[PDB]
Amino acid sequence: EYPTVSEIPVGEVRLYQIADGVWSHIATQSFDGAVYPSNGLIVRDGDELLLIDTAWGAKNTAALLAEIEKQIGLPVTRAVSTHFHDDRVGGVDVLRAAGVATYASPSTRRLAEVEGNEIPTHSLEGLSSSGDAVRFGPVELFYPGAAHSTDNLVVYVPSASVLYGGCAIYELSRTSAGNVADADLAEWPTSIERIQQHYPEAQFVIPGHGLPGGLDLLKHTTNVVKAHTNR
Ligand SMILES: O=C(Cc1ccsc1)N[C@@H](c1ccccc1O)P(=O)(O)O
Numbered sequence: 001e002y003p004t005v006s007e008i009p010v011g012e013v014r015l016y017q018i019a020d021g022v023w024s025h026i027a028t029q030s031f032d033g034a035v036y037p038s039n040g041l042i043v044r045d046g047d048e049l050l051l052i053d054t055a056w057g058a059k060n061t062a063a064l065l066a067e068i069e070k071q072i073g074l075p076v077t078r079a080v081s082t083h084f085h086d087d088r089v090g091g092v093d094v095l096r097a098a099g100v101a102t103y104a105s106p107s108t109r110r111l112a113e114v115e116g117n118e119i120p121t122h123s124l125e126g127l128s129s130s131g132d133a134v135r136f137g138p139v140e141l142f143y144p145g146a147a148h149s150t151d152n153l154v155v156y157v158p159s160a161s162v163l164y165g166g167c168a169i170y171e172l173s174r175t176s177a178g179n180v181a182d183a184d185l186a187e188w189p190t191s192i193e194r195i196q197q198h199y200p201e202a203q204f205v206i207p208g209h210g211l212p213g214g215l216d217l218l219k220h221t222t223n224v225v226k227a228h229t230n231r
């Protein structure tokens, strides 16, 4: 049901309806001779859409916008990037050129600039301290603390009980740590516990890569991170 790498030729984007007015977007990138899927989120707000994360690159993000227009037909008016790496901000320039207002926390914007990555236009206030939450249209944005990266945000859709964890939450099939070059391994389990504490009612949990599940993805991610810590 949920699409995988083999259903998505590189350059294409699939959409998957999770609930009324909530979709994930799924795209792929080739890297070091392997192919990786990547998820973002789309949330309806009246007659407009809020986009969470690019589709990992200019080409994929252009295709994302075309697929949204084909299948949903509502304008993407705002986008939020959940951390500074290329799989979340690569494509921001395409969004900006298409008239989408792009957003990230000020920490994300600064780290993106340092990395030479694309930089969302607007700065999201009120997310600088672990445990901070703000409403942004139809979602709540939450800063759980440092995890996969120091700036990583998660997104909750209260109407649908959908929790999008981005790259701070691993799919179940991933049992080894990913790229953790910018991670806070020491704080990551604590940050995951803040997510559990704030969204214990979540029914659908979307990882940054791979298959959705339930809140079981949180403790799974903690297990993987702790195993890596003790490597
Ligand atoms: O977006 C990036 C820029 C990046 C950083 C170091 S190499 C490439 N990497 C993502 C990624 C996904 C699939 C496999 C490897 C990856 O590192 P990420 O670690 O954010 O989830």
Ligand SMILES: [Zn+2]
Residues within 6 Å of the ligand: 083, 085, 148, 149, 167
């Ligand atoms: Zn990352």
Ligand SMILES: [Zn+2]
Residues within 6 Å of the ligand: 101, 121, 122
């Ligand atoms: Zn603006």
Ligand SMILES: [Zn+2]
Residues within 6 Å of the ligand: 087, 167, 208, 209
């Ligand atoms: Zn990622």
